[PDB]
């Protein structure tokens, strides 16, 4: 197994996957690494299994159809993995914890949002459709772009949104377009 966490790239108290060489901090993995279970298979492995059991699940889909899906176990897992893929980027640090807004010439957003809030919401089964999760994720970046206006710091929102969107299209097998 790897000797660093797949998500944050640090050593520490790591839990190792039995079916692949990845390792994780307990609360870096999503869902948090399960207490017992030997063998244990990480989220990367669980997602690959879904694909392998239903190869057709990789044919192209329309985003509008994906968003209206109910949050049954497989879609729950897919959103957990998509959230984890965002945390895998170091620039996620800016969007992880609760933000505050006090900048001359800007007013904070009406509905603040952050990664750890989305994480809690998924853990607590608060989303009934994929759309709920995707809306909160996209709101994180939209709030940031609107608040930071012409400051160059707005680019961090564009960057992390791009990671989100590329991974959304991969995980949910969105039909490729120009
Ligand atoms: Zn970690
Ligand atoms: Zn694995
Ligand atoms: Zn099948």
CB 160 within 8 A of CB 141: yes
CB 138 within 8 A of CB 67: no
| Conformation bin of residue 58: beta by default, left when phi > 0, alpha when psi is -120 to 50 | alpha
| Protein residues near ligand 1, an ion, with CB under 5 A | 5, 7-8, 25, 28
C-alpha distances out from residue 133 to 21, 69, 101, 123, Å: 29, 11, 23, 12
Q: Which of 40, 59, 78 is the last residue of a domain?
A: 59
Answer yes or no: do 49 and 8 share one domain.
Answer: yes
Q: Ligand 1 center to residue 119 CA distance, Å?
A: 15
Answer yes or no: do 65 and 54 share one domain.
Answer: no
First CA to last CA across the chain, in angstroms?
39
Ligand nearest the Cα atom of residue 20? 2
Ligand nearest the Cα atom of residue 17? 2
Q: What is the spatial distance between Cα 136 and Cα 157, in angstroms, rounded to a whole number? A: 14
Q: Ligand 3 center to residue 47 CA distance, Å?
A: 14
CB 137 within 8 A of CB 128: no
Answer yes or no: do 54 and 64 share one domain.
Answer: no
CATH of the domain at 4: 3.30.40.10
Q: What is the spatial distance between Cα 172 and Cα 84, in angstroms, rounded to a whole number? A: 14
C-alpha distances out from residue 94 to 12, 18, 80, 118, 159, Å: 22, 32, 19, 14, 11
CB 114 within 8 A of CB 95: yes
Q: What is the spatial distance between Cα 31 and Cα 8, in angstroms, rounded to a whole number? A: 15
Q: Ligand 3 center to residue 67 CA distance, Å?
A: 21
Which residues contact residue 39 at a Cβ distance below 8 angstroms, ignoring those fewer than 6 apart? 18, 19
In what helix (H) or strand (E) does residue 15 lie, and over which residues does it extend? strand 14-16
Answer yes or no: do 115 and 177 share one domain.
Answer: yes
Q: What is the spatial distance between Cα 60 and Cα 52, in angstroms, rounded to a whole number? A: 16
DSSP state of 16: E
Q: Ligand 2 center to residue 45 CA distance, Å?
A: 4
Answer yes or no: do 44 and 85 share one domain.
Answer: no
Q: Ligand 2 center to residue 135 CA distance, Å?
A: 28
Determine the 3-state secondary structure of 26 from DSSP. coil
Q: Ligand 1 center to residue 14 CA distance, Å?
A: 8
Q: Which of 59, 81, 103 is the last residue of a domain?
A: 59
Is the previous residue joined to 51 through a cis bond, with omega within 30 degrees of 0?
Answer: no
Answer yes or no: do 154 and 98 share one domain.
Answer: yes
Answer yes or no: do 101 and 177 share one domain.
Answer: yes
Ligand nearest the Cα atom of residue 88? 1
Answer yes or no: do 164 and 96 share one domain.
Answer: yes
CB 28 within 8 A of CB 5: yes
Question: Structure tokens of 61?
Answer: 């889909």
Q: Ligand 1 center to residue 54 CA distance, Å?
A: 30
* Angle, CA of 27, 23 and 49, to the nearest 5°: 95
Q: Which of 29, 59, 89 is the last residue of a domain?
A: 59
Determine the 3-state secondary structure of 51 from DSSP. helix
Answer yes or no: do 89 and 161 share one domain.
Answer: yes
CB 17 within 8 A of CB 67: no
Ligand nearest the Cα atom of residue 50? 3
Q: Residue 164: which domain range? A: 60-178
Q: Ligand 1 center to residue 126 CA distance, Å?
A: 25
CB 147 within 8 A of CB 101: yes
Answer yes or no: do 48 and 66 share one domain.
Answer: no
Answer yes or no: do 90 and 165 share one domain.
Answer: yes
Answer yes or no: do 11 and 80 share one domain.
Answer: no
CATH of the domain at 107: 1.20.920.10
Task: Compute, in degrees rounded to 10, the torsion defined by CA atoms 132, 68, 172, 95.
Answer: -10
Tell me the torsion sign for CA atoms 150, 155, 161, 166.
positive
DSSP state of 129: B
Total number of domains constituting the chain? 2
Q: Which residue in the block uniquely carries the two structure tokens 């759309």?
A: 131
């Amino acid at each position: 197994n790897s000797n660093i966490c797949e998500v944050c790239n640090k050593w520490g108290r790591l839990f190792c996957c039995d079916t692949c060489p990845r390792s994780f901090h307990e609360h870096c993995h999503i869902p948090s690494v399960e207490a017992n279970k030997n063998p244990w298979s990480c989220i990367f492995c669980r997602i690959k299994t879904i694909q392998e059991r239903c190869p057709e699940s990789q044919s192209g889909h329309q985003e509008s159809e994906v968003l209206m899906r109910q949050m049954l176990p497989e879609e729950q897992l897919k959103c957990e993995f998509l959230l984890l893929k965002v945390y895998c980027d170091s620039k996620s640090c800016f969007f992880a914890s609760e933000p505050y807004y006090n900048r001359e010439g800007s007013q904070g957003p009406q509905k603040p949002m952050w990664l750890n809030k989305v994480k809690t919401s998924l853990n607590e089964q608060m989303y009934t459709r994929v759309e709920g999760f995707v809306q909160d994720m996209r709101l994180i970046f939209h709030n940031h772009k609107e608040f930071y206006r012409e400051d160059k710091f707005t680019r961090l929102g564009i960057q992390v949104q791009d990671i989100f969107e590329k991974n959304f299209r991969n995980i949910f097998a969105i039909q490729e377009t120009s």
